[PDB]
Amino acid sequence: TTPLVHVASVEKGRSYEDFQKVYNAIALKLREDDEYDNYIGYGPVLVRLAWHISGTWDKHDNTGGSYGGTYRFKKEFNDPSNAGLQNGFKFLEPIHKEFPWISSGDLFSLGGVTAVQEMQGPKIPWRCGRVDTPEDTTPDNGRLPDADKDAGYVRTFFQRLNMNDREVVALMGAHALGKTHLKNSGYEGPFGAANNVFTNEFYLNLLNEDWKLEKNDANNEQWDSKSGYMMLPTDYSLIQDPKYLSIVKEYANDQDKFFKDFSKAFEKLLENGITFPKDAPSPFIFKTLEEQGL
Amino acid sequence: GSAKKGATLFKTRCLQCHTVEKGGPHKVGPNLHGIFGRHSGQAEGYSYTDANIKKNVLWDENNMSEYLTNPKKYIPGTKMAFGGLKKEKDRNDLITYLKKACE
Numbered sequence: 148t149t150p151l152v153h154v155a156s157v158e159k160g161r162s163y164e165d166f167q168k169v170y171n172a173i174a175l176k177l178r179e180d181d182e183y184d185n186y187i188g189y190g191p192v193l194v195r196l197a198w199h200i201s202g203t204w205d206k207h208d209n210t211g212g213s214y215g216g217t218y219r220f221k222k223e224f225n226d227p228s229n230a231g232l233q234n235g236f237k238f239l240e241p242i243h244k245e246f247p248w249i250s251s252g253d254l255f256s257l258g259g260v261t262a263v264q265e266m267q268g269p270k271i272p273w274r275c276g277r278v279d280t281p282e283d284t285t286p287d288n289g290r291l292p293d294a295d296k297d298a299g300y301v302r303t304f305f306q307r308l309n310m311n312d313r314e315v316v317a318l319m320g321a322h323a324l325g326k327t328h329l330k331n332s333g334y335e336g337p338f339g340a341a342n343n344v345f346t347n348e349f350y351l352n353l354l355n356e357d358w359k360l361e362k363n364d365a366n367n368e369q370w371d372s373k374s375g376y377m378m379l380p381t382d383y384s385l386i387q388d389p390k391y392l393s394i395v396k397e398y399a400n401d402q403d404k405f406f407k408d409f410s411k412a413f414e415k416l417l418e419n420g421i422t423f424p425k426d427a428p429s430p431f432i433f434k435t436l437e438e439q440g441l
Numbered sequence: 442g443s444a445k446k447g448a449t450l451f452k453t454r455c456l457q458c459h460t461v462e463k464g465g466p467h468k469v470g471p472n473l474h475g476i477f478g479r480h481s482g483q484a485e486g487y488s489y490t491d492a493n494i495k496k497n498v499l500w501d502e503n504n505m506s507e508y509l510t511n512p513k514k515y516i517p518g519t520k521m522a523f524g525g526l527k528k529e530k531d532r533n534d535l536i537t538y539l540k541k542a543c544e
């Protein structure tokens with residue numbers, strides 16, 4: 148029949164300016180709804196939503212991924228790995244009604260990019276053209292990674308998304324943002340100090356704080372610092388594996404580099420599984436609220 | 442402004458990096474006791490960026506409002522990783538609370 152191929156197809160008569168206005172709506176809602184999750188804001192959950200809709204991809208048969216907007220169906224919606232993302236979905240709801248022409252995949256991925264940018268992270272080039280696919284194309288539950296694992300598991304899992312060591316370390320830096328919630332994932336607590344500003348604090352914290360491995364209220368084991376942070380076992384395994392450890396120290400010493408590699412990795416992530424034709428526009432870099440004067 | 446609402450804003454948005462009480466521990470950022478009417482970059486025992494010291498400003502309610510609106514804008518090169526209170530109300534409330542909290 149031939150391998151499954153997903154050709155990027157730009158929304159009819161839409162262009163960069165249109166997508167900037169979607170971005171603006173997302174960013175403005177981010178700025179204004181600042182009470183959510185005890186004043187963390189929606190940023191981190193939008194980033195997590197974009198990663199999760201993307202992280203279902205399987206490079207071997209092109210089954211998962213962002214293209215199909217499949218997060219909009221119950222099977223994928225109620226995936227236990229995805230508990231809590233309904234908040235990001237509901238955030239993005241009024242924006243979808245304002246721009247009904249945008250495909251669901253384009254909207255989710257754009258949510259994540261906007262969040263990373265607004266939170267003073269690096270600029271992330273973004274490509275439009277994802278197309279909504281039928282409910283039977285939705286990936287089965289269980290494609291997202293588990294937290295109670297080691298470095299070997301992490302490296303192996305990321306092979307499926309075509310990510311190498313540097314890309315994995317870079318992407319994991321997103322755990323600078325936000326927190327774990329007990330009712331969502333059986334883990335509880337802030338990953339770091341700046342909850343909604345994108346920094347290299349993940350690396351610095353991993354290396355410089357004093358961590359202890361203990362059981363939380365769900366009887367899950369997590370690493371807690373005396374300074375009040377927490378890390379999942381998968382996070383901490385990035386200092387337990389020598390090759391990972393090198394890269395960790397690298398990003399800890401150089402935020403600029405980390406921003407560059409993260410931008411590359413994140414865009415790759417959001418784009419895995421997508422074939423962009425020749426006629427396709429160049430990737431879009433969107434203007435933050437800040438550089439529009441707000 | 443509402444000192445109580447300000448107390449909530451501090452607990453959720455500043456406390457992870459600052460304590461307020463006298464002789465309070467330095468954390469991510471410096472202890473903020475006595476902050477108003479003292480020069481920036483002057484907490485004893487704390488290691489500031491040179492940018493914070495170079496800014497050289499006696500902290501008061503207006504400059505505090507400005508800083509907290511956008512800390513990187515008021516002190517470029519600052520290491521305080523904080524987005525900014527973008528609602529004037531919240532700035533007034535926070536500063537009200539901080540006024541008494543750190544006396």
Ligand code: HEM
Nearest residue numbers: 191192194195198292293294318321325326327328331332
């Ligand atoms: C081995 C890889 C990973 C594991 C095991 C993992 C696991 C988790 C878990 C269990 C949570 C808690 C969810 C909750 O309780 O609300 C979480 C939160 C989060 N994850 Fe990861 N994740 C991984 C990779 C990533 C990647 C690659 C990204 C982004 C590119 C990411 C972004 C986030 C963000 C931003 C949050 C905080 C969300 C919020 O505060 O609401 N994660 N992660």
Ligand code: HEM
Nearest residue numbers: 340341455458469470481482489490493519520521522523
């Ligand atoms: C509205 C919330 C906050 C307020 C009102 C606040 C208060 C202040 C004040 C008044 C200063 C100047 C201190 C001086 O010059 O002696 C300062 C600096 C600093 N704060 Fe914050 N803080 C807040 C949130 C945070 C957060 C979230 C972090 C870290 C994630 C942080 C970490 C720091 C650091 C590291 C400095 C020193 C900056 C430098 O030396 O360049 N603060 N803060």
